[PDB]
Amino acid sequence: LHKEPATLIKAIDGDTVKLMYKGQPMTFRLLLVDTPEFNEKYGPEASAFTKKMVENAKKKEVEFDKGQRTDKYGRGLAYIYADGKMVNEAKVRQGLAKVAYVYKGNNTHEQLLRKAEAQAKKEKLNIWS
Numbered sequence: 001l002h003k004e005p006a007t008l009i010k011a012i013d014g015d016t017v018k019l020m021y022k023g024q025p026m027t028f029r030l031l032l033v034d035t036p037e038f039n040e041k042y043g044p045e046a047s048a049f050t051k052k053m054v055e056n057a058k059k060k061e062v063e064f065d066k067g068q069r070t071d072k073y074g075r076g077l078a079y080i081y082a083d084g085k086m087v088n089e090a091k092v093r094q095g096l097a098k099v100a101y102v103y104k105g106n107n108t109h110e111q112l113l114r115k116a117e118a119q120a121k122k123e124k125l126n127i128w129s
């Protein structure tokens with residue numbers, strides 16, 4: 001896989017980010033994660049964590065997987081990095097998202113994210129408390 005730069009337009013919520021990617025605005029859905037909705041327990045925390053990780057970063061990068069690059073809603077599907085740290089992974093590591101929507105073709109980082117979720121769950125952290 002490879003990491004491409006992008007410029008932040010809007011950190012939308014826990015699972016999506018709007019970026020200027022090669023000069024065009026697109027909404028990216030984070031691969032492999034599902035975040036509690038804002039009006040559910042941990043929703044507001046999970047959303048603010050995601051937003052601030054992205055917004056505080058100097059460098060934002062997009063990393064497409066080996067399968068489809070857009071979902072059935074027209075969203076880009078990617079791993080997003082914030083100063084070299086994977087946003088998808090951190091959300092899960094901190095017990096503020098769950099590993100989810102793991103399709104063939106776009107599962108490169110599945111083992112890594114499941115490792116993070118296992119640590120969160122062992123620690124009974126946040127959604128796992």
Ligand SMILES: Cc1cn([C@H]2C[C@H](OP(=O)(O)O)[C@@H](COP(=O)(O)O)O2)c(=O)[nH]c1=O
Nearest residue numbers: 015029030031032033034071072077101103
């Ligand atoms: C993460 C991800 C979500 N999606 C779609 C599947 C879900 O649609 P369906 O429920 O219609 O299947 C939806 C979940 O996204 P949200 O969690 O943003 O709603 O996003 C994909 O198609 N591929 C993906 O990799």
